[PDB]
């Protein structure tokens, strides 16, 4: 059974009654006997709802977050893990996963170019309504990219590593809000 395997994943995504993941699967399965969810289709999900904005680039970014998770395609299992990080963790360990979504290239360190991508994509998710309500010296992915990169303290020859990435947030507990894709 699916849930069984995922349950094995344990805390990494225990979620509610893990049995709920089983019923889900059967539903998501019948709703799409595709079995292998491709990035294109997933992008269809975000392109069909998100009326507030057009997180198109963001939807494709998340897909790469758990798709390239050493496999090939986004299976329902990987789908639940995504729906779990989207908004659920609050006391368990998940930052490690954050080091990936915030990194599309692959993994080693987070460079200004890596965040820049997620930042640009996010910008799209931010409709004009809110964007228009932005202060000064901060209205572009390039200007904000300097706010996050500067929040850590890493010049050019300074690639944020997976460790410090967690420490940069351990000290200044004022990042969690910004770093949040939201």
């Amino acid at each position: 059974a699916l849930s069984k395997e995922i349950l094995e994943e344990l805390q990494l995504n225990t979620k509610f009654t893990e049995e709920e993941l089983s019923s889900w699967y059967q539903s998501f399965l019948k709703e799409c006997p595709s079995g292998r969810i491709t990035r294109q289709e997933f992008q269809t999900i975000y392109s069909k709802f998100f009326p507030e904005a057009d997180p198109k680039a963001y939807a494709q970014h998340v897909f790469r977050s758990f798709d390239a998770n050493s496999d090939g395609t986004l299976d329902f299992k990987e789908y639940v893990i995504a729906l779990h990080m989207t908004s659920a963790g609050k006391t368990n360990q998940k930052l490690e996963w954050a080091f990936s979504l915030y990194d599309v290239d692959g993994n080693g360190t987070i460079s200004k170019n890596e965040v820049l991508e997620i930042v640009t994509a996010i910008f799209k998710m931010i409709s004009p309504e809110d964007t228009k309500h932005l202060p000064e010296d901060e209205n572009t992915p390039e200007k904000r990219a300097e706010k996050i990169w500067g929040f850590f303290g890493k010049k050019d020859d300074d690639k944020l590593t997976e460790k410090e990435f967690i420490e940069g947030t351990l000290a200044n507990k004022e990042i969690l809000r910004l770093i949040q894709f939201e």
Partner: peptide, 16 residues
């Protein structure tokens, strides 16, 4: 109840 509409959009979407 709070920021739960996001997870509900990805799942409720691939659902219906």
């Amino acid at each position: 109840m709070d920021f739960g509409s996001l997870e509900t959009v990805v799942a409720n979407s691939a659902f219906i």
